Write a protein that binds this ligand. Sequence first.
Ligand SMILES: CO/N=C(\C(=O)N[C@@H]1C(=O)N2C(C(=O)O)=C(COC(C)=O)CS[C@H]12)c1csc(N)n1
Ligand SMILES: CO/N=C(\C(=O)N[C@@H]1C(=O)N2C(C(=O)O)=C(COC(C)=O)CS[C@H]12)c1csc(N)n1
Length: 263
Amino acid sequence: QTSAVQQKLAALEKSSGGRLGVALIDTADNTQVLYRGDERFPMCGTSKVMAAAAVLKQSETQKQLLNQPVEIKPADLVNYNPIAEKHVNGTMTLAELSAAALQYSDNTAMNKLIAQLGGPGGVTAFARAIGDETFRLDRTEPTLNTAIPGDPRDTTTPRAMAQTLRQLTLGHALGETQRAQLVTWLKGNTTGAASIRAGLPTSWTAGDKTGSGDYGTTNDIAVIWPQGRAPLVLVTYFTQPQQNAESRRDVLASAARIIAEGL
Ligand SMILES: CO/N=C(\C(=O)N[C@@H]1C(=O)N2C(C(=O)O)=C(COC(C)=O)CS[C@H]12)c1csc(N)n1
Ligand SMILES: CO/N=C(\C(=O)N[C@@H]1C(=O)N2C(C(=O)O)=C(COC(C)=O)CS[C@H]12)c1csc(N)n1
């Protein structure tokens, strides 16, 4: 079948010139709205949530892990290091690296999270451990953001990512203290105002993690607390056919607005 919201998302996609994937979970009744919900999309920076969560999980059995210093060398710097660049020849704790990766989308910080987990496969193993059989991280930063059409590397589906984000932020995939830390980090994101959040009623609160890459790949995943109602989880992925396509955060905002209006 095809619902009204699904029809509106289809119209948005057609006018956009790209491919749109959406997954909503409304925890008020556990109902879902999917659009290309089982198609694979490049995650880009949205994968940073899985890496941070995996390190939080490790910290459950090490009350001091988040305070562990990690050396940042000049050679470690990649293509987007707004926080790490200030700490070259110094150190950052895993908590600092998690906050930098999530709230500033720092790619060098993400690489340190991946390294702590033993490589991209370590992040994938954590995803499997919490019931996500779809997610796959294959590369480090920044090549995990190449976003080449058809490439299965570093992809997931909207359905899978929404279910996992729910488990992490609203469920029991993490311990209570760790879940609160993850939510606090997401709510403090600095990069998300033009994406999902731009399509929501002003009064609503949210935590999100953006992603972007080649092929005008423009992503966002969010946990939303609408004013006076049970939280939602929303994933919006978008990618385009030309390598040099422009970013389209307005498409994500439009998708979120359609979703919000349809509740
Ligand atoms: C080889 O890697 N290529 C990247 C890339 O590093 N994407 C990563 C990603 O996701 N990040 C986000 C992100 O979270 O969206 C921002 C956020 O940007 C700002 C200013 O907030 C900065 S770029 C980084 C890329 C990005 S766009 C494009 N053509 N390529
Ligand atoms: C000359 O371009 N250099 C880029 C680059 O491709 N940036 C692109 C661009 O502008 N985009 C926008 C944008 O148009 O605003 C956003 C905004 O947020 C999202 C989600 O797209 C994310 S980055 C992407 C780059 C990537 S990493 C690095 N150090 N430089």
